[PDB]
PDB file of C-alpha atoms in Angstrom:
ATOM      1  CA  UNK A   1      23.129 -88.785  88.138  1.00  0.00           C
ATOM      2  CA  UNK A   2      24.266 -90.981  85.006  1.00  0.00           C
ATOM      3  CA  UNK A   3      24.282 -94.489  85.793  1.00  0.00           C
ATOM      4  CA  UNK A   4      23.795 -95.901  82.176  1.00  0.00           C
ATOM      5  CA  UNK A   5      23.861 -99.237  83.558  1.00  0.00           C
ATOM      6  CA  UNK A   6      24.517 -98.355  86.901  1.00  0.00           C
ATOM      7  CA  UNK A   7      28.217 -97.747  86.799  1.00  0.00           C
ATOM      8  CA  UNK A   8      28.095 -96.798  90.837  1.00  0.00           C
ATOM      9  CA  UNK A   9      26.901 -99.560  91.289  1.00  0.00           C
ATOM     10  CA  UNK A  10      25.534-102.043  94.533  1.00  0.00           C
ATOM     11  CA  UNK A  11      28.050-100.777  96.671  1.00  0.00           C
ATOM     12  CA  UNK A  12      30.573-103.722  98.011  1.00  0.00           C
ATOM     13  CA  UNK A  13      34.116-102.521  96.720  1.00  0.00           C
ATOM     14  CA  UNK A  14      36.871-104.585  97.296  1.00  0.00           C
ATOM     15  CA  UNK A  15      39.308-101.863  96.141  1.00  0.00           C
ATOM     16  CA  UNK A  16      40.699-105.230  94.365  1.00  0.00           C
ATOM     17  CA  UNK A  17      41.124-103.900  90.592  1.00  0.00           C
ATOM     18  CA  UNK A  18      44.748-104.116  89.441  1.00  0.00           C
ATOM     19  CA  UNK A  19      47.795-102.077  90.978  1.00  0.00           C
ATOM     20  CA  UNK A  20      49.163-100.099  88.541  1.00  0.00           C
ATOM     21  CA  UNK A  21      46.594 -99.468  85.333  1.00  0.00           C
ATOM     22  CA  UNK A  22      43.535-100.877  88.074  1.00  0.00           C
ATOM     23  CA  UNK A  23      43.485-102.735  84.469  1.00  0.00           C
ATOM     24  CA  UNK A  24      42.193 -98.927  83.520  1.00  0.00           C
ATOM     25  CA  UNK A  25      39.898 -99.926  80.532  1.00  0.00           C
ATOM     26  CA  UNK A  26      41.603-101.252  77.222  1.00  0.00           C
ATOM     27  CA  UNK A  27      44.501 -98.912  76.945  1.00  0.00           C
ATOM     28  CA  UNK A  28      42.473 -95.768  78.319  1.00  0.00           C
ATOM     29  CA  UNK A  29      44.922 -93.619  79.042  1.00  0.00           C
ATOM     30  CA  UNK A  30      41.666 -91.678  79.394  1.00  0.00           C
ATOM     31  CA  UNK A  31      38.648 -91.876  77.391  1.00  0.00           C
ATOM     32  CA  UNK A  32      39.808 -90.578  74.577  1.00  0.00           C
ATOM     33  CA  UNK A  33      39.367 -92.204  70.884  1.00  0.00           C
ATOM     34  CA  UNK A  34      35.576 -93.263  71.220  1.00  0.00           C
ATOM     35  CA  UNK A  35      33.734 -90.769  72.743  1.00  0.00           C
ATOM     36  CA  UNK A  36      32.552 -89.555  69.448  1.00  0.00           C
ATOM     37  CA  UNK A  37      29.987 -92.878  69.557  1.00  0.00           C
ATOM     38  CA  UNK A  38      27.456 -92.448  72.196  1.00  0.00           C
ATOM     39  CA  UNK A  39      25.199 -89.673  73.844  1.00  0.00           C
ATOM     40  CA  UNK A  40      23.401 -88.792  70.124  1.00  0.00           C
ATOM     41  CA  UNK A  41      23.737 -92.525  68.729  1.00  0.00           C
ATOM     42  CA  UNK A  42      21.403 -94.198  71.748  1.00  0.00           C
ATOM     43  CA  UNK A  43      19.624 -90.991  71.618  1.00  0.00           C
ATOM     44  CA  UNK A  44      17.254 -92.484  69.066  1.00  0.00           C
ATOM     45  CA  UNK A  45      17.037 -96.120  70.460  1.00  0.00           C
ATOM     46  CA  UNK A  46      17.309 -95.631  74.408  1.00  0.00           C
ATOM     47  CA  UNK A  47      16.972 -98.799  76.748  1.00  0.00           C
TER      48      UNK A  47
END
């Protein structure tokens, strides 16, 4: 499923991000330097 903090969340969606970039997450042009950081980190500490 993968809702890590349910990230599909309670369903109301205004499709009211920005235009353009939706504001598409702090210069992701994808998900690209960072993903090196989580899966195995939390893997030890899970909440």
């Amino acid at each position: 499923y993968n809702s890590g903090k349910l990230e599909e969340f309670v369903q109301g969606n205004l499709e009211r991000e920005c235009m353009e970039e939706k504001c598409s997450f702090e210069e992701a042009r994808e998900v690209f330097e960072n993903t090196e950081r989580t899966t195995e980190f939390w893997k030890q500490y899970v909440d």
